[PDB]
Amino acid sequence: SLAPEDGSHRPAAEPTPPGAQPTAPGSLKAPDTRNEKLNSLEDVRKGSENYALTTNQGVRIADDQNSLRAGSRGPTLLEDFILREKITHFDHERIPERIVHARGSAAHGYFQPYKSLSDITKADFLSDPNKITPVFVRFSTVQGGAGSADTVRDIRGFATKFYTEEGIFDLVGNNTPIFFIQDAHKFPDFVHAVKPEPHWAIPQGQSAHDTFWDYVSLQPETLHNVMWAMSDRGIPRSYRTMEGFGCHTFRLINAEGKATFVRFHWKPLAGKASLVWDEAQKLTGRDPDFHRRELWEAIEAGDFPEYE
Amino acid sequence: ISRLGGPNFHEIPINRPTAPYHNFQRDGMHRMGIDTNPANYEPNSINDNWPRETPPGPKRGGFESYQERVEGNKVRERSPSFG
Amino acid sequence: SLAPEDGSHRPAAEPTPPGAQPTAPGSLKAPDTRNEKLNSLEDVRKGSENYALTTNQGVRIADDQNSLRAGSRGPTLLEDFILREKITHFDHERIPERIVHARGSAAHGYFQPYKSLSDITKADFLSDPNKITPVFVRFSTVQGGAGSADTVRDIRGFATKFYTEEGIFDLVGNNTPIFFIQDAHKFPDFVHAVKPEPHWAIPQGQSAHDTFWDYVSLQPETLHNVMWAMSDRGIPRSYRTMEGFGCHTFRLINAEGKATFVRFHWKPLAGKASLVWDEAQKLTGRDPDFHRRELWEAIEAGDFPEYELGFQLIPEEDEFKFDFDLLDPTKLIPEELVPVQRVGKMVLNRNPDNFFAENEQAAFHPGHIVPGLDFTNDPLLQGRLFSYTDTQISRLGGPNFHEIPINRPTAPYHNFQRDGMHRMGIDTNPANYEPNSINDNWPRETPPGPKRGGFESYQERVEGNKVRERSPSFGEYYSHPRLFWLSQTPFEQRHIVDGFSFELSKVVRPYIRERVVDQLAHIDLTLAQAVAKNLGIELTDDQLNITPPPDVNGLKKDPSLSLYAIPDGDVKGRVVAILLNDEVRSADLLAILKALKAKGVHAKLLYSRMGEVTADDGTVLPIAATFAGAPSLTVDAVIVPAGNIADIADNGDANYYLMEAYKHLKPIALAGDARKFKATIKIADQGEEGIVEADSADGSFMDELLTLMAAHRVWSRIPKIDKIPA
Amino acid sequence: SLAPEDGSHRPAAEPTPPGAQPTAPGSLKAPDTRNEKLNSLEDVRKGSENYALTTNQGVRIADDQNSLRAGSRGPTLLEDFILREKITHFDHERIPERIVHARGSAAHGYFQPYKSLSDITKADFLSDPNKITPVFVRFSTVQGGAGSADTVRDIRGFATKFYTEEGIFDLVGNNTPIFFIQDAHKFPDFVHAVKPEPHWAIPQGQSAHDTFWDYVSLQPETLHNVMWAMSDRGIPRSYRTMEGFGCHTFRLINAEGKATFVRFHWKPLAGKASLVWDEAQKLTGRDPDFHRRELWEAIEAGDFPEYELGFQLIPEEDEFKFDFDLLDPTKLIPEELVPVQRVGKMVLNRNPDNFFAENEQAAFHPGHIVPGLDFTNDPLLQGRLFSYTDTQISRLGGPNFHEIPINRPTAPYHNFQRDGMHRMGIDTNPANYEPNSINDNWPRETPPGPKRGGFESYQERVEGNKVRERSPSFGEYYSHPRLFWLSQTPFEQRHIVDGFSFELSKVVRPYIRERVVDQLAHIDLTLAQAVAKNLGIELTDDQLNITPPPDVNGLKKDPSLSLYAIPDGDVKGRVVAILLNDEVRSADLLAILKALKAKGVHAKLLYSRMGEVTADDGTVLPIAATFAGAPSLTVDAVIVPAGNIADIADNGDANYYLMEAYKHLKPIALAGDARKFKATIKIADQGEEGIVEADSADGSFMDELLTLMAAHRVWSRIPKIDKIPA
Ligand code: HDE
Ligand code: HDE
Ligand code: HDD
Ligand SMILES: [S]
Ligand SMILES: [S]
Ligand SMILES: [S]
């Protein structure tokens, strides 16, 4: 047995402050934190302790250290299906990242209203303060790839999937109340302009380059959101300490059929807080996973991110 | 990998084993299984090396190939016995 | 017209030094550079000047600013095909990244051999010193994603696609001579261990976490490549200043059928040079694109990356002449035992036009060999042969990945394979099978021979049972790690100690650190104790008495394993920060730049804001960047000319600039009143080695600075840096 | 393993009648046939003669017969990269077939207008009678898979890609002028209902099953296109002998901005002709590739398929002037009300080289329009515009499907779209966005205007609330089916009755059959009774009293809706079977072939074995096929020359050949003693209209036979075939 005698390989399944224990998969860290969605995923969770190592077809593997070869210094044989299945699955691990917001960090939680909103909306999840709606929330940057740094200067995404009794509602918002552009037809122009430039694929995670500012200088509708990004809004301390916005006017519709225009807000109960530019930029080098880590460790500690 | 869209074709319901399957393979398109193992490699100490290899034996043992003697040069050649 | 009237939007189509012009696609930057492969890509190049904006179907668009809607404040209509085509293409821009080496930077070039190697190989590309072979080379890290940082601590890849007249040959190597594991079956285990951990996908671009060090502690075969990764080899200065290696024993096969064992080498003609860890880490923050940028800018300046191809050659009858197995890819062949024979030179002289189309889509695979080469039973190489074909079916969308333009052979290709997704070639052959009579059996098989023959494998003898078994001969883990460590200078050993100590401090479970210190004590006690001390760990009496492993074939060191033991410095294409003031002394600046120019060293003029300043004599000095904007991390040395020093003397950024460069062992030069800065870095009045100083920037002031830059960094300074708060 | 020395493996590169030579890729059969699009494909056409067989990487293969193994009876080795490339390509050949119209056959050709249409449209391809536009056309069934049969009962597709100077225009039509449903939202319900049922995936190529008739019984909007499918229009003789229609009201826009509604037509210059059901059904077993083969062989013979493009034009102010809605795609515009104006001619004159690359990968989509054309609010068309771009993402592997060679425009295309899987074009533009200054904003938008202008949508007024609601004007379902019924000849009517009767007899659930018959009672009582009688159903008193729907704008019938009521036969390209005997009277064969050749009618010489027979004068006659191997299903008429009739008089296959041809209403001619076969088909001494007979085959005999063939089938024989046991 390879684990240490004293059992110090395994993190306590109780809330612990950052750095006190190794981090762990959520169902192992907090087995008794439940909601309808988390429970419904049990059919696909797979454990490991006390099980035999197998192929994907259920065949027990005797030797997971060697390829099948003709003699112990010989060529590898085509009939080694165990090696080929293992290397095939490896070879095909990756899927395309998101076109934008490829960098992002997510957690499970729940939502509950403070009071029935039936006077203004028939949305079932807003109909009773007793209605508990599971959520899965993903926070993100915009420009950089899935392996880019967290504390860049960028807009941040804030996407919430509400698993309601009357369907999925996704509230797909950002951390500023507007966008750079007015018409969707220009989205690939704006995004190409902010992304790494096409000849050489530089710079990652940064608007600080000629094409972005070229587009901005030629499209003054951009200037409002550019102001937000150049502010310390663009460099939050934590996904816990930033605001969220729905970006658009939507409508609520009530049982009588009356429409009300609405814009959505998320107010962080831990308050608003951002880094300073020098600190953010250096932090992309010292810990490019700083926000991902901070979110995971706040939840492990019981410092649950809360938004109104 | 093209016909069924990727390396997780064993998780398409008709294809699934009824026998247990556990290993350190991860990800791929259409991934259904949510692995809770702290480890995705072996040997590991962080999960006490589970899931673990199993020696061959008379029942419920690991797969080991028959130790057939191979002898010859690397050749692209049809056996004369096939002619 | 949106372009400025003075044409300042268009970069000069001629060699210019870094920062002088905006960068540009290669065919616009350097239209006069060519080779056979670049010429053949012309059929797919797309221009843009003077053309109308269209759909992909060739319909001209009138308004590319708006969607179609019912009234100008109305709903967007489904019939807007111009919107949905444009948004559809955007929606599907991304393809899966490489499983490993996803972060990489690539350039076109050419290779030519120094003489015909026909006595040892029939490979056509090596048959004639006049035969010039286009190449495309991609350098990469291993762990991080395509949008991770360049100057991480990691292994680097060094992949070369040779477009030979007898097929594609891909030499898919790394910047170290070995690998972490012995058998390919373990590759997903090792890679999973070094990659971000699967619960939370942390950390990116780093081996400094529990699962990596768990695997290493349990798999001593890894320690040799770990030594390399923990040394300054893991943080190169530039893709231009690292070695490349082919990793495995392959074979050369001559026209007579004789097989010779070969390992492949690339020697950087710009010399070997690496960063230091604090600098490398901070640089991942200040410019995560530094190596990609440096490569592109070197080529645009005419500082073409050059590498010499070399072979270590071992006769077949010498297979068992060494203390280690030639097939064991965790073992290096010391150059003291088998010298590198020079073979030819490769020059990278053109950037791509489109990074996605040429770099992201390029597919390299070590099974892509040509007649004159062959494999061996290296069990890591054996498994690689499966992987690099397989992985392309998802990454590049199917089995016609050779028809993507960058991947196309320049040699003819004809066969009976048909269809598949993205099929470009339209085959007119009446037959799609052989043997056939309906096309007189064309295209036809070709017997092997001295030139232009079919591929036939070398008839190596195979004997033994079908086994999943590691060769006993591979069961030795410590002697190569030890040879490596003993071959390093004392400052290089110090940086290895600090690499392990820093990485193990990030491992959360203490027993994993202890287990790895135990492994170190099997390699070298001094190493092990120094790492232990940094971790607060005390070696046991048993650990103190572990017998060191034996030397490797009589060797107690091999200086070729050191970056620095043997000077191979080259200052051409290096860069100096010049720290400006509002009244620079022109005569200092003239002499600085004249000497830098004469050796091909670049400069960047830095100040506290953008714009210009004016020297004493009225010369207008344009500013490249601010002190904060272009940190010392990004340059090789700093020079401060004389003048109105009081202007920058209390500037935090300016002071810190010299502290950072000082800490990172870079040459510093101070002329006249700029000597006032000696106080910020605590330099004595009689001066110290590595700090150039004088009343004015010449006679021998630039020669001194340039001598220091040829030696790369001031290693003697290392005992003084701990004191400086930087 | 090679070609025969006589060169007989290779088809002559000259036009040759069906069966005279093996068929071949178009560029080899007809190398001098060119057009702008065919030429532009030269970059990707790949030959084979005199080339070495290689891997896809350009490595010559020595042994393409064997895997690499350890000894010649040993295991195959993983290092066999030649085996794995070849098998990997093969393992990934297939791409997803089209959701609908998966079964299709395609050819290249060209179009030109008869005169400039600039008064009604500014479309460049309709602007000049001497501007030629390349086309690629694919004909298809709808329901069955890509390996289903051709001569099923189904709607046919007729899709034309016009490669115009101002962009690709795809006219994506069918062989009937309406569709089964009104709103695109129901398309998956209808298609799922006609497709193989989901539990067991039966039946292929057939609407004759419960789910289809369940949907029709519940959605009377479908009854109009059902009437067309049940008629002989559902079983065309050839893609050369059916009409095409664009299905929707589109708009033409002229340079002055005037909009005219238009519906598109294609008139077959070879005339309108269909099979009979029993023949069609049996032919799906004897030759499931009959229409694919006939199309390919017509083009190899020079019987180029020709179609006339025609437009129904309705001025904008006449939108509401009919008693149906112009935007309802279940409604046709009778040519009695709105005549088809002839517009131009399309000729299909070359087959592809590789069916997969050019046919299977072609992507047609009706949203691919060009300036001068525009859409309408037809709610079926509206949703089609979403589907034809979306579906290519999976079928063709991503958003670069326009780079697959067959799909590329010949017109320039330049834009700021980048990347996507298997990206071919390498963009050099410094800019990938607009507005930009860095490339002076190229490529640039272009204002709309008379010619070469940007696309702008016609400024149609929209007024209404956001609703999911069917227009009340669409809620009439029976008048157009009735118009169609009343316009058919009596034998066409009988065949419609028979198609409904045959289909509904395969519906297992009897209440579905009853509900369909109730729908038929709302269209025409005579039809409804005739179907009921065949299903053993008796109409109720109420059903008997259903008031017939109103005439369509005063019309009692419109003969243009019939296949046959107005003669339009053309025999060129048709085929006759000639049943040989072992001593043919050469004088008869001489006169038969001379007359057939004068009208471009082909012949196939049949016998009871293959090889040769010798005629009375020593002429050696090669045999194309046996009586069983090329049944009368595959020909238009049968001729039996004189000679040694005893040789075949008691041959069961030869007698049956005539019985099947007789049953199927085909002309038969019998010369000399071949008149003895009159007994097998019960023709009286006096003779019968449709049986040509004389002492010998002469001028008069062949004229009579060719007159019969110009009328396609012998409809007057129908009363006589009930009794024949065939
Ligand atoms: C206001 C909040 C907001 C706005 C206004 C937009 N984004 Fe987002 N985006 C996609 C496209 C898209 C378009 C076409 C527009 C304006 C027309 C916006 N964006 C502006 C996308 C390409 O479809 C996207 C990429 C992956 C994906 O699934 O959809 C996408 C991502 C995205 C996210 C990430 C959600 C997640 O996966 O975690 C968020 C938070 C936004 N967008 C916000 C957003
Ligand atoms: C010797 C230099 C070297 C070695 C020993 C290995 N890698 Fe590499 N690698 C792939 C798999 C693979 C396996 C199975 C093994 C040992 C079993 C190695 N690696 C060790 C791959 C997953 O098939 C890979 C990912 C993308 C791809 O197409 O192949 C792959 C990448 C890779 C590159 C990247 C080439 C490029 O596109 O720039 C390089 C330089 C190596 N490997 C070197 C290498
Ligand atoms: C809203 C869905 C929809 C509806 C309402 C229609 N179509 Fe369609 N059609 C498709 C959605 C579609 C498709 C699913 O997108 C296909 C199959 C895959 C493809 O590329 O297009 C297709 C293919 C397709 C083809 C085959 C082109 C080829 O040869 O590749 C033809 C000829 C037609 N259609 C014709 C018609 C006609 C005459 C319609 C009646 C006016 C019609 N379609 C309505
Ligand atoms: S937004
Ligand atoms: S290696
Ligand atoms: S239609």
Two structure tokens written together for C356:
């996605």
Backbone angles phi, psi at D341, to 5 degrees: -90, 125
H helices of C118-241, in order, are: 187-194, 210-218, 223-230
Of residues C279, C404, C252, the one with CA closest to residue C341 = C252
Of all residues in chain A, the one with the smallest CA distance to D80 is: A78
Residues contacting A69, CB < 8 A, separation 6+: A75, A76, A77, C377, C379, C382, C466, C467, C468, C469
Of residues A133, A119, A284, the one with CA closest to residue A206 = A284
Count helices and strands (H / E) in chain B.
0, 2
The SS3 call for residue A126 is: helix
Q: List chains touching C (3+ CB pairs under 8 A).
A: A, B, D
Helix (H) or strand (E) holding D347: strand D341-350
Two structure tokens written together for D386:
């979403």
Centre of ligand 2 from the C-alpha of residue C495, in Å = 28
Tell me, yes or no, if A134 comes closer than 8 A to chain C by beta carbon.
no
Q: Whose CA is nearest to atom 1 of ligand 4?
A: A247
Two structure tokens written together for D325:
């809605």
Distance CA D257, CA C126 (A): 67
Two structure tokens written together for D298:
């017509």
CA torsion through residues D53, D54, D60, D64, sign: negative
Distance CA B11, CA B34 (A): 12
Give whole-number Cα distances, D536 to D277, D532, D533, D539, D645, in Å: 21, 6, 5, 10, 46
Residue from D394, D433, D437, D467 whose CB has the most chain A CBs within 10 Å, to mutate: D433
Domains in chain A (CATH in brackets) are 24-308 (2.40.180.10)
- Tell me the CA end-to-end span of chain C in Å, nearest whole number: 49
Given a contact cutoff of 8 angstroms between Cβ atoms, the answer to whether D537 and D500 are in contact is no
Of residues C293, C245, C239, the one with CA closest to residue C271 = C239
Tell me, what DSSP letter sits at residue D488? Answer: S
Helix (H) or strand (E) holding D272: none
Two structure tokens written together for C95:
């393809």
Of residues C528, C247, C238, the one with CA closest to residue C380 = C247
Tell me, what DSSP letter sits at residue C715? Answer: G
The SS3 call for residue C244 is: strand
Q: Which amino acid is at D594?
A: K
Report chain D residues whose CB lies below 8 A from the CB of B72.
69-74
Chain C neighbours among D 169-198 (CB < 8 Å)? none
Of all residues in chain D, the one with the smallest CA distance to B80 is: D72
Distance CA D373, CA D311 (A): 13
The SS3 call for residue D455 is: strand
Residues contacting C148, CB < 8 A, separation 6+: A145, A147, A148, A288, C102, C103, C141, C204, C205, C288
Two structure tokens written together for D109:
């050709």
Which atom of ligand 1 is the closest one to the Cα of A138? 38
Burial classification of residue D478, based on how many CB atoms lie within 10 Å of its CB (0-12 exposed, 13-18 middle, 19 or more buried)? buried
Report chain B residues whose CB lies below 8 A from the CB of D68.
74-76
Question: Which residues are near ligand 4 (CB < 6 Å)?
Answer: A 178-179, 247-248
Of residues C606, C711, C600, C599, the one with CA closest to residue C660 = C606
Residue written as token pair 């087959």: D351
Q: Which amino acid is at C674?
A: A
Backbone angles phi, psi at C640, to 5 degrees: -115, 110
A279: left (phi over 0), alpha (psi -120 to 50) or beta: alpha
Burial classification of residue D103, based on how many CB atoms lie within 10 Å of its CB (0-12 exposed, 13-18 middle, 19 or more buried)? buried
> Per-residue b/e over D215-244, b at no fewer than 16 CB within 10 Å?
bbbebbbbbbbbbbbbbbbbbbbbbbbbbb
| Distance, CA of C157 to chain centre | 6
The SS3 call for residue D387 is: helix
Given a contact cutoff of 8 angstroms between Cβ atoms, the answer to whether D415 and D443 are in contact is yes
Residue from D73, D78, D395 whose CB has the most chain B CBs within 10 Å, to mutate: D73
Q: Which residues on neighbouring strands pair with residue D374, listed in sequence order?
A: D251
Strand ranges for D211-269 from DSSP E: 244-245, 250-253, 259-268
The SS3 call for residue C618 is: coil
How long, in residues, is chain B?
Answer: 83
Given a contact cutoff of 8 angstroms between Cβ atoms, the answer to whether C200 and A292 are in contact is yes
Of residues D156, D292, D342, the one with CA closest to residue D235 = D156
Q: Which residues on neighbouring strands pair with residue C133, listed in sequence order?
A: C111
**Helix, strand, coil percent content, chain C, rounded in steps of 5:** 30, 20, 50
Solved how? Answer: X-ray
**Ligand 5 pocket, C178 CB below 6 A?**
yes
Distance CA C171, CA C158 (A): 8
Centre of ligand 1 from the C-alpha of residue C33, in Å = 42
Query: CB-CB: which of D63, D71, D79 is closest to B70?
Result: D71
Give whole-number Cα distances, C500 to C226, C537, D249, D304, in Å: 9, 13, 75, 78
Resolution of this entry, Å:
1.8
Distance CA B7, CA B4 (A): 8
DSSP per residue, A223-238: HHHHHHHHSGGGSBS-
How long, in residues, is chain A?
Answer: 308
Could C390 and A62 be called an inter-chain contact, meaning their C-beta atoms sit closer than 8 Å?
no
Could D75 and B70 be called an inter-chain contact, meaning their C-beta atoms sit closer than 8 Å?
yes
Question: Which residues are near ligand 2 (CB < 6 Å)?
Answer: A 91; C 98-101, 104, 138, 140, 157, 159, 172-174, 179, 184, 187, 247, 362-364, 380, 383-384, 387-388, 391
Largest CA distance in chain D: 91
Of all residues in chain A, the one with the smallest CA distance to C104 is: A201
Residue written as token pair 């940028």: C293
Distance CA D571, CA D581 (A): 26
Radius of gyration of chain D (CA): 28
Chain A neighbours among C 451-480 (CB < 8 Å)? 462-473
| Distance, CA of D438 to chain centre | 50
H helices of C547-604, in order, are: 586-599
Which residues of A are catalytic, by number? 101, 174
D489: left (phi over 0), alpha (psi -120 to 50) or beta: beta
H helices of D133-289, in order, are: 187-194, 210-218, 223-230, 277-286
Of residues C186, C179, C214, C191, the one with CA closest to residue C468 = C186
Count other Cβ atoms within 10 Å, centred on residue C261: 22
Could C462 and B64 be called an inter-chain contact, meaning their C-beta atoms sit closer than 8 Å?
no
Report chain A residues whose CB lies below 8 A from the CB of D433.
188-190, 192-193, 211, 215
Strand ranges for chain A from DSSP E: 45-46, 69-70, 104-111, 133-140, 157-164, 167-174, 244-245, 250-253, 259-262, 265-266
Centre of ligand 5 from the C-alpha of residue C177, in Å = 6
Residues contacting D125, CB < 8 A, separation 6+: D111, D113, D131, D133, D162, D164, D165, D166, D169, D370
Report chain A residues whose CB lies below 8 A from the CB of D417.
188
Largest CA distance in chain A: 80
User: C637-640 and C575-579 as β-strands: parallel, antiparallel, unpaired?
Assistant: parallel
DSSP per residue, D582-619: TTB-HHHHHHHHHHHHHTT-EEEEEESSSSEEE-TTS-
Give whole-number Cα distances, D564 to A210, D238, D711, D712, D720, in Å: 70, 15, 9, 9, 20
